Ligand binder design. Sequence first.
Ligand SMILES: Nc1nc2c(ncn2[C@@H]2O[C@H](COP(=O)(O)OP(=O)(O)O)[C@@H](O)[C@H]2O)c(=O)[nH]1
Ligand SMILES: [Mg+2]
Lengths: 424, 66
Amino acid sequence: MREIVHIQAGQCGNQIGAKFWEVISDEHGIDPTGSYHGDSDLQLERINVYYNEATGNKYVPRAILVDLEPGTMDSVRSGPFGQIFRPDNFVFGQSGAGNNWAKGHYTEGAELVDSVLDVVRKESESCDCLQGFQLTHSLGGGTGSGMGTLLISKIREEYPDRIMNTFSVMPSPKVSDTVVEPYNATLSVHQLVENTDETYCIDNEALYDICFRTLKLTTPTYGDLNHLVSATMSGVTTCLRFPGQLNADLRKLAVNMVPFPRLHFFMPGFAPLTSQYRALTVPELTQQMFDSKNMMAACDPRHGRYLTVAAIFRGRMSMKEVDEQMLNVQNKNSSYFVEWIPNNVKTAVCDIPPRGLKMSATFIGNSTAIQELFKRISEQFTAMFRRKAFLHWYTGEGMDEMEFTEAESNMNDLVSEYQQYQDA
Amino acid sequence: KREHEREVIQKAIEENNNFIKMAKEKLAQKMESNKENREAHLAAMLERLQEKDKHAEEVRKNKELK
Ligand SMILES: Nc1nc2c(ncn2[C@@H]2O[C@H](COP(=O)(O)OP(=O)(O)O)[C@@H](O)[C@H]2O)c(=O)[nH]1
Ligand SMILES: [Mg+2]
């Protein structure tokens, strides 16, 4: 299959999505107006995956921008590459969602969702073979969290045979906007367990830490986090946008990364962490990439076990060095890789590097350590729920404690399952 | 799931409506019981004054006999 359909929902969603479109539009030689102006053919060979070709060369990101408040989307229309987006594809309400999962999922989002699905049909029907959808959102607010998951369900109802993929930003007290974030997160984790094939877990905690204690940025802004994010998103979408050995699809990825249906929550990592005149050595990239101080989650992989791993190496380097170093990471730390999935680390190389960098390495892990993230949230949730705090904001939207109870259970279960496989 | 979603938003609409309704009732009960209470008090005051009047007529009549 070929074409992907991209969806941005909420503030955080539209911010990281706009950055992603800037970054890969640069990689593919597309100026802010939609005109190709690059050297290589490699830049246009698979451009059909993320861009719809229109009129005089113009390329338009197959993207749908969604929000319950007009702010962030105006911000987007206004800013860099602001007018590469089809103007029809801005779908927005006025009410807002008040960092409330119930509002985005049940009340306000329900109004907006049908107009979103309308734009979704228009894009999907203009595709030769739609692989599926990619959604960007946080799980801690209201629009992205609740409306996004509602969209995930709606879309699955209408395209049950396509692939659901999300970059979902997990909330962290270090970087918080509201106390209800654990609730919102636990609710959408519930949805995601059931309705996505692959969710990249972008944990704001890790982005903070890597901004603070590695990039040594004492006061990080959401832009500082989002540059880590857009770097990761370019990284993990590379082999889907560029020709090569392992021409990748969303399904094969799923098939190759998801041993068990529910355990589809991935940990991304990137080297070199930027914020670079000296390119690193393959050995460097590799070891940096597998260290925790380069994980975008928060979990330490040395605490659990890799079920599956995919590495992408971008730039001009020796494939011999790449294979040697990859096998060196495994053979050396063969304890952290399960023995019941043989040959579970795959590697790809693409010649085109990211902007600014000459050599780079991105990494995708189905590791059992993600249980830590989920556990963290579970705790925070429980604390409050145990004393039924801040629940009125949700109950007044028609919800019942039972829903929450169920969600919690599910996440708890997820953790359990993950652990089950850590001891195998 | 779609039916659940319809039920939740239905619950929200019903609960707000019940709020507005119980408010309207409570307030009407209060305003009416206040009006009954205040009127009763002024009525009894004016009636005390009327018994004062009747006793004044009684006094005048008692003297126009002496
Ligand atoms: N990394 C990152 N996280 C964000 C950004 N904006 C909000 N968040 C996180 O997302 C959550 C708030 O959700 P938000 O996207 O503002 O709400 P929405 O518009 O209702 O979906 C909190 O957990 C924030 O820490 C962003 O630009 N980048
Ligand atoms: Mg916000």
